[PDB]
Design a protein around this nucleic acid. Structure first.
Lengths: 167, 252
RNA sequence: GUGGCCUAUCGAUCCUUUAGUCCCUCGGAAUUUGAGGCUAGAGGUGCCAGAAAAGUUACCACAGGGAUAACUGGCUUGUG
RNA sequence: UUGACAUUGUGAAGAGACAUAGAGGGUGUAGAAUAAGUGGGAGCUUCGGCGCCAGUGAAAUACCACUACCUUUAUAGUUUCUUUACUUAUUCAAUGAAGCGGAGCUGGAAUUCAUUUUCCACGUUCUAGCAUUCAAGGUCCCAUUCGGGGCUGAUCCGGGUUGAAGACAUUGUCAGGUGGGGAGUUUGGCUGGGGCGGCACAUCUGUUAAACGAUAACGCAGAUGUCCUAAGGGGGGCUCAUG
RNA sequence: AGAACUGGUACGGACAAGGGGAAUCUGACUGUCUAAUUAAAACAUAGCAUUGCGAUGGUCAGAAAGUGAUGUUGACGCAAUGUGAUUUCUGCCCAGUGCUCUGAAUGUCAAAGUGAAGAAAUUCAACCAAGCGCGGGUAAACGGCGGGAGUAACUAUGACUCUCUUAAGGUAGCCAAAUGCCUCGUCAUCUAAUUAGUGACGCGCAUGAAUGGAUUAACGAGAUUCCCACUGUCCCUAUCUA
RNA sequence: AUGGUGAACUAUGCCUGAAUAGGGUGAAGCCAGAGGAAACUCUGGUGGAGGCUCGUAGCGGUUCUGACGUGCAAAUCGAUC
RNA sequence: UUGACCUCAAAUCAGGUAGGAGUACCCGCUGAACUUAAGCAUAUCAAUAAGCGGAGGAAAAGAAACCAACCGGGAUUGC
């Protein structure tokens, strides 16, 4: 019923409350499953979290995977996106239909987590590139180690998806 | 008296052997000390196409160690090799392109061929195993191996098999619509027939337990229970979900 | 002086349950409980000694009828 | 589809709740107290303790009882509970038991406690060019033979050989539950044929009864299958209402 | 193929042989069945979607097994429905009727076993498996579809207000900018000068009918309507031959 | 309801054979010529592809609702599609 | 590094055995519908019709763990 109603201000309030609360046993596993499910519908990170979770590991942990098999790739793309970003509309539209051009025409604000917010704020106020080309695609590896030699610890020590993560 | 076309497999006539076009099976020959942990070498020359579908077959005939005989054995061939290339698969040796090794002597990423799931035995009395080398990573923990496929299932079994690395030109055949139609009879004159899948709002009127009458509408759920009645099983069985899988992935 | 001046002054059988006689049954003599009788209540029918059935099918055939056996409108309403 | 016994042996088996009885704490304010919602207050062996002993005060402290039991043990035992090896019964792919496991004449890699108490070894791995006949070689025999007969080469045990598993699984009589595949049975009359679903007709009010309309029920709480604990019988006296 | 002459202004001279064009609704064309009244708008085929699927599993058939097919298959293939060429192809909802259920198990739960009384029989309180109850998913499988909430009753009326794809007088944009040939012409800006550049309006040779109240080529023994050519069916009767 | 027996016609599956007038329309690829700085844009031949258009037998039986039906035929003949 | 008994097999010989028709009557095993029905099930029809196998020349059954409560009883079947 949590996520249930969950679908406000007081939301995130008691939200984070029982949130950190509920924060091995896959009953609750699949619960949180359908949870983040309807979630994204209307976590996420924690979503693919429990994701790779069942990953390692009939019903309902199974149909879930089926649906999830028919940000990941989207992440990579919008990645280079926000990349040149901080470094927009057109890019988003291309990565996204009649209403695509409808948009193409703070609006986009409400439109549309942490990353998103930051980007938006920066853009409004202004109203790793190696990593860039990298995730983009070897010649790439080339310019890679190029600027490479050109927290550095954990640094030198896909995987780049996790990388952007830490970043 | 009026049955449905799901309860037919009980005559032994229009469901028997319908595949003159093909030749032999695909299961390997006699197993010995070689065809396992130690040293196993395979051959591939006459890459005759697999009859019935889209796959290659080779005349993998081994000179029988027990007796001077070279019985012709049509086995499954692979893509990537030319007209003749022996297998370089040694457990005490190394590894190259197109080799046959068990699911324990190799690291992650090992797509072998299908033959058996049991620790060898020339066609294990079973078969509820893999469909061939088609396997990603394994498991270093003992002789256990946890395989995984995008179909949506898990399996933990042994780590011994006689599958050779190789690919088959099947990807794209089902990805490219049967444009120039005219396919159903010769389609599945292969092994039997199971392609009429077959309608009629008034196919069998004074009956239709599903729902029909004189208008295009069903009534009862087409989701027939598995353990309830074997005389009404016509349509969906053991339903759970229903949606629309989009092309855009990028999921968790 | 066996009620009100006259008029009004009734709870079937079978089945089940309960109470009463020291008798009957006890059918291999005899003995100790014993499901089934006789008498006497309650309850399950107020159709007058007071007992009525089930509710899906214009996909066919045979044997029938001039009171279509089938019981007062399921539509309009004569001299305004 | 599910469960007990038996088929089907054995008890060295990790951790609970019981089938008869005797102690252990009954701690909320105040009263130094264990006054536990309610009941019982003239009492049980009588020489003797408390019978109602003091301050406070809604309840006052032996006494055969409906009692919620925080935590143990308990005599011959206990229906179902994960469990490594050894299994004379079932099923079993190949079967021309094909070169196997442990142990056992031997190297290399890894570092030190006195030596092998452990872990990979044991005929092909650039090419449809090539491959077999009691294996090319040694020792021991009918003699000088163009052949043949042991051992070693290829040593044994095991007889469950390279591969699933196990006192597992399958059969038969065992409450009831899933199911018109099939069989049998089932259609008085009731809107001048028939044609939605339900079957809430008769007791003052409230309730029974889901609200301005209706609305049954030998159901519930007084009375009620109308009334009477003298409105009966009998004697005397009196002679009604309305205008 | 071109160039002449001639006749009845004749010419594929008989025989074979598509009469044709333009719309609406339904429907893709081709293939198959109703032996003997129904040849169609049905079924089937391409495309798309859903359910089920790891061999010690499931489906079909049989009285049973050590019988058979599926299975010469290995997520690429295998069994059962609906939809039936491409463009088009749900806006939202899971309380009821089903299925699935590694979610939730002691309210209820037979016999055997176990526990009292009893020299016996009958009756017989508690424990346990499964089903039922609760909950979620699922409506391209059957519904609903002027929707989904918050409001002095403990559940019974659903006004008012708010959100949304719940609104009767037809005003979609852009337009000297690569789309403007006419044009080195007007206005405005910079400059000694600049036919090039930038910024409005107007009649834009050759840009667009976004979104909204029920969208189509080719093909044809389905049906309806109209026109041209032709026609002794009718008006309006009759004659010849085998 | 019980006890028995069939695949020469019709329908479905597997295996083994034979047979199927004459054309128009001319899809990829290839060749020649011409234009272009490049990724290319066309015409004229050869090749004759296709669940395609017209038209016999075979297959098939919708229209001309005829003739016939006290059975020419236990479902036909001719014509058309 | 060497001979017997038991169990389990393999022929075309002397000497033996097996596979069915008819089938009144009778016996063992398994197993239906219709008629009647103060509606339907239970029940009757019916330890049946039909079909199959074996044995006999009659079969099944029968020389007592049987039948009684009397005057003790003296094998089976059938009218």
């Amino acid at each position: 019923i949590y996520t249930f109603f969950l679908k406000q201000r007081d939301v995130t309030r008691i939200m984070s409350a029982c949130a950190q609360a509920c924060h091995e046993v896959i009953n609750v596993m699949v619960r949180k499953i359908a949870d983040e499910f309807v979630s994204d519908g209307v976590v996420a990170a924690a979503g693919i979290n429990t994701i790779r979770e069942i990953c390692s590991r009939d019903e309902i942990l199974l149909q879930d995977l089926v649906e999830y098999k028919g940000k990941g790739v989207n992440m990579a793309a919008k990645s280079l996106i926000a990349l040149y970003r901080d470094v927009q509309e057109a890019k988003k539209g291309g990565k996204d239909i009649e209403l695509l051009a409808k948009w193409k025409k703070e609006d986009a604000d409400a439109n549309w987590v942490d990353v998103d917010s930051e980007e938006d704020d920066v853009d409004g106020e202004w109203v790793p590139e190696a990593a860039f080309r990298e995730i983009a695609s070897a010649k790439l590896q080339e310019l890679r180690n190029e600027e490479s030699v050109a927290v550095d610890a954990s640094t030198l020590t896909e995987e780049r998806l996790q990388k952007v993560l830490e970043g | 008296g009026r049955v449905i076309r799901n309860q037919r497999k009980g005559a032994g006539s229009i469901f028997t052997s319908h595949t003159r076009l093909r030749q032999g099976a695909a299961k390997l020959r006699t197993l010995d000390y070689a065809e396992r942990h130690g040293y196993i070498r395979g051959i591939v020359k006459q890459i005759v196409h697999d009859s019935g579908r889209g796959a290659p077959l080779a005349k993998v005939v081994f000179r029988d160690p027990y007796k001077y005989r070279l019985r012709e054995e049509i086995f499954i061939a692979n893509e990537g090799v030319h007209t003749g290339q022996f297998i370089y698969a040694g457990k005490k040796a190394s590894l190259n392109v197109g080799n046959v090794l068990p699911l324990g002597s190799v690291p992650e990423g090992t797509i072998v061929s299908n033959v058996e799931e049991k620790p060898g035995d020339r066609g294990a009395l079973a078969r509820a195993s893999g469909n061939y080398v088609i396997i990603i990573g394994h498991n270093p923990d003992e002789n256990k191996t946890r395989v995984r496929l995008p179909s949506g299932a898990k399996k933990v079994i042994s780590s011994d098999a006689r599958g050779v690395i190789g690919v088959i030109a099947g990807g794209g055949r089902v990805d490219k619509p049967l444009l120039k139609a005219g396919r159903a009879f010769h389609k599945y004159r292969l092994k039997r027939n199971s392609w009429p899948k077959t309608r009629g709002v008034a196919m069998n009127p004074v009956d239709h337990p599903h729902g029909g009458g004189n208008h295009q509408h069903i009534g009862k759920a087409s989701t027939i229970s598995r353990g309830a009645v074997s005389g009404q099983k016509a349509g969906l069985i053991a339903a759970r979900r229903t949606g629309l899988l989009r092309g855009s992935q990028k999921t968790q």
